[PDB]
Structure formats: C-alpha cells, structure tokens
Scaffold this active site. Structure first.
Site, short mmCIF file in Angstrom:
data_model
loop_
_atom_site.label_atom_id
_atom_site.label_comp_id
_atom_site.label_asym_id
_atom_site.label_seq_id
_atom_site.Cartn_x
_atom_site.Cartn_y
_atom_site.Cartn_z
N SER A 168 34.61 -56.78 -8.39
CA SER A 168 35.61 -55.67 -8.22
C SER A 168 35.04 -54.14 -8.46
CB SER A 168 36.89 -55.98 -9.00
OG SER A 168 37.44 -57.03 -8.80
N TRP A 185 43.94 -55.20 -10.51
CA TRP A 185 44.59 -54.67 -11.94
C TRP A 185 44.59 -53.21 -11.52
CZ3 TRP A 185 43.21 -56.49 -17.41
CH2 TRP A 185 43.75 -55.69 -18.33
N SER A 210 42.40 -53.54 -6.22
CA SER A 210 41.15 -53.94 -5.93
C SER A 210 41.55 -55.21 -4.82
CB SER A 210 40.58 -54.82 -6.89
OG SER A 210 39.88 -53.83 -7.96
#
Length: 245
Positions: free
Chosen positions: A98, A191, A51
């Site tokens: 995100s 992540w 992201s």
C-alpha cells in the site's frame, strides 16, 4: 449444511465485537448480497476508499499507458512514514505494500482531467474527485459504500469492468494475498487515517478450487492503536465460518 443462520450471524458479529470495533462484512454469492457483522447500517454509508482506490488507480494507469507492470518507480530518497516505502517498486509491489507515494506518482501522470473522466466512466463510488489529483481518495471528496465496494470486487473478479481484459488480469495478479487449502484470496486493504473517524477496508474475492469467485468487502472503524491485521483476521474467520474457505 446444519448450522443455522442465527448462529452464523452471531459468530460473525462476535468477531467484530472481540476486536472492539464497529463494522460490517458484505459477501456476494452470484447476485445475492449478504450483510454480516456488528454494525449492519454501515452497508450503504459512504466512506473514503483510502488504499482500496489503488485497484482502480492501477487499472486507469495501465489502460492509459502511464505505467507498465515491470516499470520500477524509483524512491526519491526522502523520508517516508514506513521504511519499506523507502525503496524502488513496481506497481505490483506498491500494491502489496500500500505504498501511496507510488500511486500518487501514477495519479499525477494520469492527471486531473483524465482521472476525473475515468472515475466517472467506471462510475466508482460518488464519482467525485474534486480539484486535487494526488489525495482525493484519502481525504475526500471521493467516497464509496461497502455495497459499492463489494460490487466493484465482483466486477473486477469477473472481468466486467470497462477496461481491456489484459488490464484487469494484470491488476488481479497484483492482489493475491493468501492461499488456503486450494482457495485463493485476492483483496486490497485500506486504512484511511486522514479522516475522522478512521476507516478500515479489506475488499476482494475468494477464488475457490472449482473456479467460483465469491466477492466480499469488510468495512470497519479503525482507531490509532489497533493492529491492521484485525482486518484480515475478521475477514478470514468470517469466510471460514460460512464455509467459503
């Protein structure tokens, strides 16, 4: 001040050790890069940006008129991984959540040919996006090192990337995540769950009350089960330890 470098290095290493993972945080002050954490060799290894690529996706999309900052990207009504993604959002809102489905729409609007040209023009990471416009930052082939991420954060913080000043300012406004005394922290988390091992990022800068900006990039191994807030916890404890905030 009076605290030894040995003690700063030991303290920051312990933040990664206590979180039971392996990682590095790179801090840049002027032109000098300092590497801290419990796995320093990660500094010049390549990982997917996950992201964190949304910073560059937004700059490309705004600069090439594929979106405006007030445009509302509508939710298509299909189920998402996270309930907060099942809603209509601007780029700014999608940056803070995100929300990859919004940035996949923006990537599809930019399209593969322009995407590859812009990623090459900014020379981000290994610069390779391959043939799939909607997932190249998630599963490969695009990769970037933590040194390259902190240097990207330094360029954006100082308006040095090859975009209009207004484009950089619009995207920087989307990245404010924390204010501490009179410091502001601008950063993007990531992540990457589509690779193994999984990768965690928090890349950004601190704007201090006097106006100096101190870029940083945290990079660690994440595991199913960990809390995403360990990225912020490590980063803020490290910046506080060094007296940056």
């Amino acid at each position: 001040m009076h605290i030894s470098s040995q003690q700063h290095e030991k303290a920051i290493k312990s933040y990664f050790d206590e979180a039971q993972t392996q990682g590095v945080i790179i801090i840049k002050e002027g032109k000098n890069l300092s590497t801290y954490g419990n796995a320093l060799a990660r500094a010049n290894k390549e990982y997917v940006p996950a992201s964190t690529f949304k910073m560059l996706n937004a700059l490309i999309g705004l600069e090439n008129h594929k979106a405006t900052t007030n445009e509302i990207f509508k939710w298509d009504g299909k189920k998402r991984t996270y309930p907060m993604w099942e809603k209509d959002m601007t780029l700014g809102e999608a940056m803070a959540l995100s929300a990859v489905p919004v940035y996949q729409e923006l990537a599809r609007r930019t399209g593969l040919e322009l995407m590859q040209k812009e990623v090459k023009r900014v020379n981000f990471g290994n610069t390779n996006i391959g043939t799939q416009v909607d997932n190249f930052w998630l599963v490969g082939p695009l990769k970037i090192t933590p040194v390259q991420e902190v240097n990207f954060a330094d360029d954006l913080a100082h308006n040095r990337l090859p975009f209009k000043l207004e484009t950089q300012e619009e995207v920087k406004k989307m990245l404010l995540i924390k204010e501490v005394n009179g410091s502001k922290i601008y950063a993007k988390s990531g992540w990457g769950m589509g690779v193994t091992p999984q990768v965690g990022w928090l890349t950004g800068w601190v704007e201090q009350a006097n106006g100096k900006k101190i870029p940083f990039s945290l990079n660690l191994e994440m595991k199913e089960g960990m809390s995403g807030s360990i990225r912020n916890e490590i980063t803020y404890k490290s910046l506080e330890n060094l007296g940056i905030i």
